[PDB]
């Protein structure tokens, strides 16, 4: 794997490290079969078929899943955007906060205050391995404003909704901080901030209104 600059031509790079997976299977090394199964993520874009050795490669993934930690979720491109749209309760309470000289210069070139409302999430999986499953997504170092229940899968290629997040928060002071992403566990341990594509794609919360 040093003779080809893997870490150009592509078919041979796929075929050599497919041979490396099969030799590390017959040896029954585990850390390299996890490593080359994880370094196949430079090439699932082209060169693959729709769920033939994706599933016959998932039978090489899932032994490394049932072992201890030897894969740790290869691709950090999951959730396109997160929307924290407060649902409609009532319009009775928005509960908000508060000559001589002087020549004119005509020639001169949001935060929320949330309430009892639930949010939304949506994401996609990158490749046609089937029935990828996720549980228990929640926020990072933030306040009480977290979700509860996690029974969800995701399909083959589609950009899938994640319904029922059902946020519950405690009131704070109105110090304006930004969140970006959440702690999401894709059928295994909770990995880190699966950040958003092409931009950080911010969100801006403040306190819950006790007023």
């Amino acid at each position: 794997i040093e003779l080809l600059n893997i870490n150009t031509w592509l078919i041979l790079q796929k075929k050599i490290l497919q041979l490396c997976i099969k030799v590390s299977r017959k040896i029954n090394d585990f850390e390299y079969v996890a490593k080359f199964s994880s370094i196949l993520i430079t090439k699932y874009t082209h060169l693959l078929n729709q769920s033939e050795q994706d599933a016959l490669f998932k039978e090489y993934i899932q032994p490394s899943i049932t072992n201890e930690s030897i894969t740790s979720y290869w691709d950090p491109f999951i959730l396109r955007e997160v929307v924290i749209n407060r649902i409609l309760d009532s319009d009775p309470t928005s509960n908000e906060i508060p000559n001589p000289q002087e020549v004119f210069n005509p020639f001169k070139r949001a935060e929320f205050t949330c309430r009892v409302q639930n949010p939304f999430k949506f994401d996609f999986t990158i490749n046609d391995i089937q029935l990828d499953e996720e549980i228990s997504e929640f926020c990072e170092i933030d306040r009480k404003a977290v979700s509860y229940s996690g029974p969800y899968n995701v399909k083959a290629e589609s950009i899938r909704s994640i319904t029922l997040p059902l946020i519950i928060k405690k009131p704070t002071y109105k110090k304006i901080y930004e969140i970006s992403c959440l702690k999401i566990s894709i059928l295994k341990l909770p990995l880190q901030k699966f950040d958003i594509i092409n931009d950080s794609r911010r969100s801006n919360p403040v306190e819950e209104e006790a007023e």
Binding site: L10, I11, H46, L47, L48
Partner: protein, 202 residues
């Protein structure tokens, strides 16, 4: 849908003759233009590259990229039409020594872009790994006033992409030496890298 990189398409020989879709031609058909219509487009290169550039050096080395994408086209054309298609001929020499491609650029590239052959081709006698190419009249930069020579570099990128796609990794730099009654003499120094330099020794 002919070459995907997903597969090599396996297709049997001696099929039918298909329809004919697009057919071109490749000989010279020496068609002229006016120098004003060239110089207007050259100043419309520079009137946008002045706008989208912050310092001098990145303006230099992205005015050079436009010349790079004429040099890597022109290298394959000029030898192939100088060795002369369906009027079948032999395959030129495919020159591979550094003062056998400098004679080709000196006598044929400048006689192709411009009407005249460039006048002189000067080795740097007091050292090695500099090779001057000069003229007496740069006919594209001749409407630029002043002395700063950043606007030269569209022609020097034509040199550099000529050699970088010829297997000779180099680097050009233009300077101005107003010798005699030729006040715009404008030397380019081609300056080959170190890692090429052993190979022509062996």
């Amino acid at each position: 849908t002919v070459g995907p990189k997903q597969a090599i398409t396996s297709e049997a020989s001696t099929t039918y003759i298909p329809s004919r879709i697009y057919s071109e031609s490749l000989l010279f058909k020496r068609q002229e233009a006016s120098l004003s219509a060239m110089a207007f487009l050259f100043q419309e290169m520079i009137s946008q590259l002045h706008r989208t550039c912050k310092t001098a050096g990145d303006f230099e080395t992205k005015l050079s990229d436009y010349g790079h994408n004429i040099g890597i086209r022109l290298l394959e054309l000029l030898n192939f039409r100088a060795s002369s298609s369906n009027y079948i001929t032999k395959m030129r020499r495919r020159d591979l020594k550094i003062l056998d491609i400098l004679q080709f650029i000196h006598g044929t590239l400048w006689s192709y872009l411009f009407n005249h052959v460039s006048d002189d081709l000067v080795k740097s006698s007091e050292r090695d790994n500099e090779y001057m190419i000069v003229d007496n009249f740069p006919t594209l930069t001749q409407f630029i006033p002043g002395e700063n020579v950043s606007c030269e570099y569209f022609v020097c990128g034509i040199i550099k992409g000529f050699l970088f796609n010829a297997g000779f990794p180099c680097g050009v730099t233009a300077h101005r030496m107003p010798q005699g009654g030729h006040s715009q003499r404008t030397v380019y120094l081609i300056q080959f890298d170190r890692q090429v330099l052993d190979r022509e020794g062996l």
